[PDB]
Amino acid sequence: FVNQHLCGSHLVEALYLVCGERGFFYTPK
Amino acid sequence: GIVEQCCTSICSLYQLENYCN
C-alpha cells in the first residue's frame, strides 16, 4: 500500500513532535 | 497498532501520545 507508506511518514514526524524527550516507538507490525 | 488506529481515522495529539515511550 503506497498510501499506507505515505501515512506512516507523517505519523513518525507527528510522534517526534508530540513525544519530545520521551521518544516513541513506530511499529507497523 | 498505530497504522490501524491513525491512518484510517485522524488521531488527535492526545491519541498520538499513546505511542510515546
Ligand SMILES: *C(=O)CCCCCCCCCCCCC
Ligand atoms: C501494516 O500493514 C498496517 C496494518 C493495518 C493495515 C491498515 C492500512 C490502512 C492505511 C490507510 C492509509 C490511508 C491514508 C490516506
Ligand SMILES: [Cl-]
Ligand atoms: Cl502524503
Ligand SMILES: [Zn+2]
Ligand atoms: Zn505526504
